Amino acid sequence: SELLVNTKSGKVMGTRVPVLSSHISAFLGIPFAEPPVGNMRFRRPEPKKPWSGVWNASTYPNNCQQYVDEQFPGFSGSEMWNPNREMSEDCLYLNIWVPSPRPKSTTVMVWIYGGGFYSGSSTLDVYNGKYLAYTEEVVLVSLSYRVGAFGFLALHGSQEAPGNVGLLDQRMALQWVHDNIQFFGGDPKTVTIFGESAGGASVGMHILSPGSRDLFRRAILQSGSPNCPWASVSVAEGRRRAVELGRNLNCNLNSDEELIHCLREKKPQELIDVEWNVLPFDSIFRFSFVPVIDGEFFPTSLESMLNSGNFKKTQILLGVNKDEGSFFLLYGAPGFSKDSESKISREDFMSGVKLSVPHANDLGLDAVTLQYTDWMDDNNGIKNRDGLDDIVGDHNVICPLMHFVNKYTKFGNGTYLYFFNHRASNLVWPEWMGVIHGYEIEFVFGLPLVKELNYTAEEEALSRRIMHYWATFAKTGNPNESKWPLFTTKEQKFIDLNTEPMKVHQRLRVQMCVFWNQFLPKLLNA
Amino acid sequence: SELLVNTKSGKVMGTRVPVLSSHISAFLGIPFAEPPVGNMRFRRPEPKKPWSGVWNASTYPNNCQQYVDEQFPGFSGSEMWNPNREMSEDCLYLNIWVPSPRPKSTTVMVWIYGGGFYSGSSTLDVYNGKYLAYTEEVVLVSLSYRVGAFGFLALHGSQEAPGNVGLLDQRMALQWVHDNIQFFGGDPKTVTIFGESAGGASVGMHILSPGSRDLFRRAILQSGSPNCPWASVSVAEGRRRAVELGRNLNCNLNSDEELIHCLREKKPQELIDVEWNVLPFDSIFRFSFVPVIDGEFFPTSLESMLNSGNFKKTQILLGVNKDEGSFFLLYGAPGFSKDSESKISREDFMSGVKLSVPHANDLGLDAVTLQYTDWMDDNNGIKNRDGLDDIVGDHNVICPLMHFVNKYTKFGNGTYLYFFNHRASNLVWPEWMGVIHGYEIEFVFGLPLVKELNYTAEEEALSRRIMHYWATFAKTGNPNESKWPLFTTKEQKFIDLNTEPMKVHQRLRVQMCVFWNQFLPKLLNA
């Protein structure tokens, strides 16, 4: 009855939420896995036992345990991304927003959140699925996953804590979406998984993992690709950070068993507290517990994989933001501050660059500097500012995504690539951060639509246009109902995404990425 | 009497040559040193014994012995640079073109010719001093110097063949100009030495050598700087090529004495014939016998010198051509030919680049390639063509001159820098060579003025404007009688020199030269 749905798991009773003009249906916090609490910490997810009775789904699920950003207490620019519902280890839920009246077989969109893998919430205001569900008559689902130690501790030979437990969770949510969205109006043969930052890299990892390939039709990856430097660790490395976390908690490090026992008994927050003390370097845009390349979730090396077309060949829509580095500078590099134009001194610049390319030796920092320095204005603090933003950005987001697109289009069935370069008229962050990494998500979810959030009409415009590109691609495999060119290894077309009449451009940051993708690596191996 | 001049050497009787409208005086082939023939081969020059009688100076001197370019037999584009008077070891003469009526104290210009140090003639048609002498009322002198083995064999510890014998000759001509141009109408306190390619590097070497500093007021260096890679060899290296030449002639290599004896007895042409067989590599823009850094002509390392302001601080006017590489590609790299658009294959490109950076190891060729390749069009033959032209050019001419300007302006008394990018409407070379290295000289000498050579009115325009910039600077230290900015380490202004209303630009090839001048070198030393 509109709101009471029978799924193979059991009966679920939704809620009717208001949206712009109309009203819609929302099913909140539906279990999809069993609570990964108790002895189940670090363990791969188990599917949720079927329930009897009606599952009430009118209130959002708890957020998974995670790092809460206290840096700008009260600042929405920073709070907008923190858990907004009680954190709990019992957090694997999913949310569905259904058009009303309920469709019969309509495109499904599965949002997968970012947070560098140590944070994320499917309940944040900017991820509110209703303007999209309503505007585009699409079934929107937003899954949850275990982030941090909890979701990514990798003690490789063990069943108690192998890697990618949080990716497996992503997958279980996908399986359930697979198995019951038909009961909601969703066409299971046309679910597009979309995501940002670790959300986007995870999407890319499901396109790559044989286990996930079959559970989704196509993908959208925004500001992330699975080959990002900060998106996966070798199992060795994962082992290392695992025991090291072990140390910070004065655990018995004799056996994995011993180790896992300990961690298994620490209160959640105790893991959260020492989580940043195991990284091997002083670096910006490096996360501690992230997907491990184990040989199960990933058969081989992501490079060998991309290289051999050993991946789902579907059609993907992807892109980047103009100022991807900013956030990471702001919080990690000396010289940048929220309340000043953060003009950086070469002293600061040089420390900055060391932070960004943590693995680069001296000759390596030398090459980075050569490439990103003005030479006729080498102490111009704005320039030093901006070029560091370009480093963190190209290095961590633009170049790996351009490498992923380039390999992938050799065997995919269509590629659409954009470049988002629109600064919300209401951004609360310093203009110097520019088009901030994560600032497209609001367009994608059509916030510029709610008149009380203060956007401009031309942004309401764009949000509408963005949402339609995203839904039309989702259901059709092409963003086009003017023409958004297809990425082609030949010509390499892409479009800027902003409030002006669309321009098609070519070879996104080619000069720069030949440096990161080809020159640097070669240099770094003698 | 107009044409009979008494110089401290003796009486000289000139000739009256026609020029545009008027007529002028020309004193041709005045001895300034004793014939470096016989046992005097390779030996530093001796000043010319004073003569009695009137030295007849109405016919051009012989050209020094040198390599004659047979590549395009009959082609003027190539013949225009070959000896046009009989070659002879007795070749150290000087030519003077005096306004008429004879001035009383007027600016003197001393042209010093290029030819990569193995060739050159002061008698070539394009070096004909009369349009300049006449247009600008300037005393123009064109000296001669020993090129090749003859002028540059460096057996370091010996008096029979130390290096830079051909530079010492440059200097002797300078001394005489110093001592007698007053007798011609020349103001000895204002002689500007100008030169191109090795002509320009030699100029730069007189600014650097304590011995020469005092003999000239200011300088013009066009397409050359003494720090060019092909402009000087270590004495070790000079030694090496010296004996090696020794071998090709089946000489007794036991002692320098032994060695020098041999060479001293070979007919000139025998040296010319094996001259190219001693270079240590397969390379484009590398000459065999060139100035040696001996510790006499050059106290220390040119770098230590530039570095410490250990040089004449006067005001210099310098610049480059747009297509400096072409000539060297055409003749040295596989794929380029006079009669085809020489589109190059990566196969050819890669051999090309190995030729250009002969000292670069593999990682070095890798860095060069990274920098000069399109990456989105890496087999576009035009692009491969053009980028190789950019390599040979930046590497061998633009970057060293930009390093020289930059160090020098730290202690000079004015710098003027241009960028010549005008393709003579009548060039006989393939359009793909562009603005060829040596193609400004005709503007500088006002050929575009003679109506029978077929230039355009706008080139007559430019030649006039070029000649005036050159003479006004010569006599005044500033090219300006609109404003041609002064090169300043700060802003780095320069002007394009072509038939259009002058544009001031900044930082000539900065991106590229940070590569050659700073990045490459660092890489090449582990």
SS (H, E, C) A467-486: HHHHHHHHHHCCCCCCCCCC
What are the backbone dihedrals phi and psi of residue A153, each rounded to the nearest 5 degrees, phi first? Answer: -75, 125
Longest Cα–Cα distance in chain A: 72
The number of residues in chain A equals: 526
What is the C-alpha separation between A88 and A80, in angstroms, rounded? 19
Q: Is B191 helix (H, G, I), strand (E, B) or coil?
A: strand
Discontinuities in chain A (C→N > 2.5 Å), after residue: 481
Q: Is B225 helix (H, G, I), strand (E, B) or coil?
A: coil
Which of A365, A373, A513, A514 to mutate against chain B (most B CBs within 10 Å)?
A: A514
Do the Cβ atoms of B51 and B8 come closer than 8 Å? no
Beta bridge partners of B505: B494
Cis peptide before A101 (omega within 30 of 0): yes
- Rounded to a whole number of angstroms, the distance from the CA of A127 to the nearest CA of chain B is 37
Active-site amino acid positions of B: 197, 324, 437
The reply to whether A230 and A278 lie within a common domain is: yes
What are the backbone dihedrals phi and psi of residue A436, each rounded to the nearest 5 degrees, phi first? Answer: -75, 140
The reply to whether A288 and A367 lie within a common domain is: no
What are the backbone dihedrals phi and psi of residue B409, each rounded to the nearest 5 degrees, phi first? Answer: -65, -10
- Rounded to a whole number of angstroms, the distance from the CA of A514 to the nearest CA of chain B is 7
Q: H-type helices in B309-410, by residue range? A: 326-332, 346-356, 362-372, 381-393, 399-408
Cα torsion through B257, B258, B263, B264, rounded to 10: 60
Q: Please list every residue in chain A whose beta carbon sits closer than 8 Å to the beta carbon of residue B375.
A: 507, 510-511, 514
What is the C-alpha separation between A230 and A359, in angstroms, rounded? 12
Which of A368, A369, A371 to mutate against chain B (most B CBs within 10 Å)?
A: A371
Report yes or no on A352 lying in a domain: yes
Do the Cβ atoms of B399 and B368 come closer than 8 Å? no
Q: Quick one: A431 exposed, middle or buried, by C-beta within 10 A (0-12, 13-18, 19+)? A: exposed
Per the structure block, which two tokens stand in for A391? 């480093």
The reply to whether A182 and A45 lie within a common domain is: yes
Beta bridge partners of A193: A110, A219
Which one-letter amino acid corresponds to residue A68? V
Do the Cβ atoms of B404 and B224 come closer than 8 Å? no
Which of B371, B378, B505, B524 to mutate against chain A (most A CBs within 10 Å)?
A: B371
Q: Is the dihedral of CA A219, A224, A229, A233 positive or negative?
A: negative
Which residues from B are below 8 Å from A when comparing CB atoms? 363, 366-367, 370, 373, 375-376, 492, 506-507, 510-511, 514-515, 518-519, 522-523, 526
What is the C-alpha separation between B524 and A366, in angstroms, rounded? 13
Q: Which long-range CB contacts under 8 A does B273-279 form with residues at least 24 apart?
A: B274/B245, B274/B248, B274/B249, B275/B67, B275/B118, B275/B148, B275/B149, B275/B245, B277/B244, B277/B245, B277/B248, B278/B240, B278/B241, B278/B244, B278/B245, B278/B248, B279/B241
Q: Is A497 helix (H, G, I), strand (E, B) or coil?
A: strand
What is the C-alpha separation between A63 and A144, in angstroms, rounded? 8
The number of CA neighbours under 13 Å toward the Cβ of B293 is: 19
Identified catalytic residue from A206, A395, A422, A437: A437
The reply to whether A253 and A386 lie within a common domain is: no
Q: Please list every residue in chain A whose beta carbon sits closer than 8 Å to the beta carbon of residue B514.
A: 370, 373, 375
The reply to whether A18 and A130 lie within a common domain is: yes
The number of residues in chain B equals: 526
Q: At what angle do helices A256-265 and A235-248 cross, to 10 degrees?
A: 50
Per the structure block, which two tokens stand in for A456? 């401009």
The DSSP output letter for A87 is B
Q: What share of chain A is helix, strand, coil (3-state, %, to 5)?
A: 40, 15, 45
Rg (CA), chain A: 22
Q: At what angle do helices B235-248 and B256-265 cross, to 10 degrees?
A: 50
What is the C-alpha separation between B314 and A485, in angstroms, rounded? 59
Q: Is B479 helix (H, G, I), strand (E, B) or coil?
A: coil
The DSSP output letter for A44 is P
Per the structure block, which two tokens stand in for B432? 């793909």
Q: Quick one: B381 exposed, middle or buried, by C-beta within 10 A (0-12, 13-18, 19+)? A: middle
Name the residue among B135, B28, B134, B445 with its Cα closest to residue B453.
B445
Q: Is the dihedral of CA B81, B86, B91, B97 positive or negative?
A: negative
Do the chains contact at A510 and B375, CB–CB below 8 Å? yes
The reply to whether A34 and A157 lie within a common domain is: yes
Taking CA atoms, what residue in A is nearest to B488?
Answer: A376
- Rounded to a whole number of angstroms, the distance from the CA of B477 to the nearest CA of chain A is 26
What is the three-state SS of A404-424?
A: HHHHHCCCCCCEEEEEECCCC
The DSSP output letter for B205 is H
Show the domain range for B185.
Answer: 4-314
Per the structure block, which two tokens stand in for B11? 């009486």
The reply to whether A19 and A163 lie within a common domain is: yes
What is the C-alpha separation between B180 and B186, in angstroms, rounded? 8
What is the C-alpha separation between B434 and B436, in angstroms, rounded? 6
- Rounded to a whole number of angstroms, the distance from the CA of B370 to the nearest CA of chain A is 7
Rg (CA), chain B: 22
- Rounded to a whole number of angstroms, the distance from the CA of A518 to the nearest CA of chain B is 8
Which letter, b or e, does each residue of B276-307 get, where b requires 16 or more Cβ atoms within 10 Å of its Cβ?
eebeeeebbbbbbbbbbbbebbbeeebeebbe
Residues whose CB falls within 8 Å of the CB of residue B265, separated by 6 or more in sequence, listed in order: none
Count, in order, helices (H) and strands (E) of chain B.
Answer: 18, 16
Do the Cβ atoms of B287 and B449 come closer than 8 Å? no
Report yes or no on B170 lying in a domain: yes
Distance of CA A296 to the CA centre of its chain: 22
What is the C-alpha separation between B275 and B266, in angstroms, rounded? 13
Find tokens 């007189």 and name the residue: B206
Q: ∠ at Cα A515 (A514, A521), nearest 5°?
A: 110
Report yes or no on A299 lying in a domain: yes
Taking CA atoms, what residue in B is nearest to A372?
Answer: B511
Per the structure block, which two tokens stand in for B488? 């300043």
What is the C-alpha separation between A517 and A406, in angstroms, rounded? 11
Q: Please list every residue in chain B whose beta carbon sits closer than 8 Å to the beta carbon of residue A507.
A: 375-376
- Rounded to a whole number of angstroms, the distance from the CA of A490 to the nearest CA of chain B is 8
Q: Beta A504-506 vs A493-497: how paired, if at all?
A: antiparallel
Q: Is B276 helix (H, G, I), strand (E, B) or coil?
A: helix
The H-or-E segment that residue B76 falls in is: helix B76-79
The reply to whether A146 and A215 lie within a common domain is: yes
Report yes or no on B398 lying in a domain: no
Do the Cβ atoms of B510 and A376 come closer than 8 Å? yes
Per the structure block, which two tokens stand in for A51? 């329930």
What is the three-state SS of B110-164?
A: EEECCCCCCCCCCCCHHHCCHHHHHHHCCEEEEECCCCHHHHHCCCCCCCCCCCC
The reply to whether A188 and A98 lie within a common domain is: yes
Count, in order, helices (H) and strands (E) of chain A.
Answer: 18, 16
Q: Beta B139-143 vs B106-112: how paired, if at all?
A: parallel
Do the Cβ atoms of A280 and A243 come closer than 8 Å? no
Q: ∠ at Cα A217 (A168, A446), nearest 5°?
A: 90
Do the chains contact at B492 and A367, CB–CB below 8 Å? no
Q: Please list every residue in chain A whose beta carbon sits closer than 8 Å to the beta carbon of residue B492.
A: 376
**Chain pair A-B, CB pairs under 8 angstroms:** 40
- Which strands, in side-by-side order, build the sheet including B139-143? B15-18, B23-31, B93-98, B139-143, B106-112, B186-196, B218-222, B316-321, B415-420, B493-497, B504-506
Report yes or no on B309 lying in a domain: yes
- Rounded to a whole number of angstroms, the distance from the CA of A224 to the nearest CA of chain B is 22
What is the C-alpha separation between A297 and A209, in angstroms, rounded? 6
Instruction: Kindly write down the DSSP assignment for every residue of A219-250, as one continuous string.
Output: EEEES--TT-TTS-EEHHHHHHHHHHHHHHTT
Which one-letter amino acid corresponds to residue A349? F
Residues whose CB falls within 8 Å of the CB of residue B289, separated by 6 or more in sequence, listed in order: B117, B118, B148, B149, B151, B152, B153, B154, B238, B241, B275
Check residue A434 and give left, alpha or beta (phi > 0: left; psi -120 to 50: alpha): left
**Who among B366, B492, B526 is closest to A522 (CB)?**
B366
The neighbour count for residue A250, using CB atoms within 10 Å, is 8
- Which strands, in side-by-side order, build the sheet including A415-420? A15-18, A23-31, A93-98, A139-143, A106-112, A186-196, A218-222, A316-321, A415-420, A493-497, A504-506
What is the C-alpha separation between A282 and B320, in angstroms, rounded? 46
What is the C-alpha separation between B102 and B293, in angstroms, rounded? 41
Do the chains contact at B370 and A515, CB–CB below 8 Å? yes
What is the C-alpha separation between B357 and A196, in angstroms, rounded? 45
Q: Is the dihedral of CA B355, B360, B362, B363 positive or negative?
A: negative
The number of CA neighbours under 13 Å toward the Cβ of A392 is: 31
Q: Please list every residue in chain A whose beta carbon sits closer than 8 Å to the beta carbon of residue B519.
A: 366-367, 370
A156 is catalytic: no
Q: Is A488 helix (H, G, I), strand (E, B) or coil?
A: coil
CATH number, domain with residue A108: 3.40.50.1820
Per the structure block, which two tokens stand in for A375? 């030479």
What is the C-alpha separation between A434 and A389, in angstroms, rounded? 10
Do the Cβ atoms of A494 and A398 come closer than 8 Å? no
Taking CA atoms, what residue in B is nearest to A489?
Answer: B376
Discontinuities in chain B (C→N > 2.5 Å), after residue: 481
Q: Is B398 helix (H, G, I), strand (E, B) or coil?
A: helix
The reply to whether A75 and A210 lie within a common domain is: yes
Report yes or no on B461 lying in a domain: no
Q: Beta A93-98 vs A23-31: how paired, if at all?
A: antiparallel
Report yes or no on A439 lying in a domain: no
What is the C-alpha separation between B150 and B120, in angstroms, rounded? 13
Do the chains contact at A514 and B363, CB–CB below 8 Å? no
What is the C-alpha separation between A512 and A520, in angstroms, rounded? 11
Do the Cβ atoms of A11 and A5 come closer than 8 Å? yes
The DSSP output letter for A518 is I
Q: At what angle do helices A346-356 and A381-393 cross, to 10 degrees?
A: 0
Q: Please list every residue in chain A whose beta carbon sits closer than 8 Å to the beta carbon of residue B363.
A: 522-523, 526
Q: Which long-range CB contacts under 8 A does A405-411 form with residues at least 24 apart?
A: A405/A225, A405/A318, A405/A487, A406/A489, A407/A306, A407/A307, A408/A207, A408/A306, A408/A311, A408/A316, A409/A487, A409/A488, A409/A489, A410/A309, A410/A489, A411/A309, A411/A311, A411/A313
Per the structure block, which two tokens stand in for B463? 């030649």
Per the structure block, which two tokens stand in for B115? 């030819």
Do the chains contact at B519 and A366, CB–CB below 8 Å? yes
**Who among B363, B510, B518 is closest to A523 (CB)?**
B363
What are the backbone dihedrals phi and psi of residue B393, each rounded to the nearest 5 degrees, phi first? Answer: -65, -60
Report yes or no on B434 lying in a domain: no
Count structural domains, chain A. Answer: 2
Do the chains contact at A370 and B506, CB–CB below 8 Å? no
Q: H-type helices in A71-147, by residue range? A: 76-79, 130-136
Name the residue among A48, A46, A36 with its Cα closest to residue A8.
A48
What is the C-alpha separation between B219 and A503, in angstroms, rounded? 51
Do the chains contact at A367 and B519, CB–CB below 8 Å? yes
Name the residue among A389, A397, A455, A465 with its Cα closest to residue A427.
A455
Taking CA atoms, what residue in B is nearest to A370?
Answer: B519
The reply to whether A182 and A304 lie within a common domain is: yes
Per the structure block, which two tokens stand in for A100? 């009303």
Do the Cβ atoms of A474 and A109 come closer than 8 Å? yes
Per the structure block, which two tokens stand in for B239? 């030694």
Do the Cβ atoms of A45 and A36 come closer than 8 Å? yes
What is the C-alpha separation between A455 and A464, in angstroms, rounded? 13
Q: Please list every residue in chain B whose beta carbon sits closer than 8 Å to the beta carbon of residue A522.
A: 363, 366
Beta bridge partners of A143: A94
What is the three-state SS of A312-352?
A: CCCCEEEEEECECCHHHHHHHCCCCCCCCCCCCCHHHHHHH
Identified catalytic residue from A197, A212, A326, A342: A197
What is the C-alpha separation between B459 and B464, in angstroms, rounded? 8
The reply to whether A298 and A211 lie within a common domain is: yes
- Rounded to a whole number of angstroms, the distance from the CA of B373 to the nearest CA of chain A is 9
The H-or-E segment that residue B430 falls in is: none
**Who among B370, B376, B514 is closest to A519 (CB)?**
B370
Beta bridge partners of B318: B221, B417
Identified catalytic residue from A324, A440, A442, A459: A324
Do the Cβ atoms of A443 and A462 come closer than 8 Å? yes
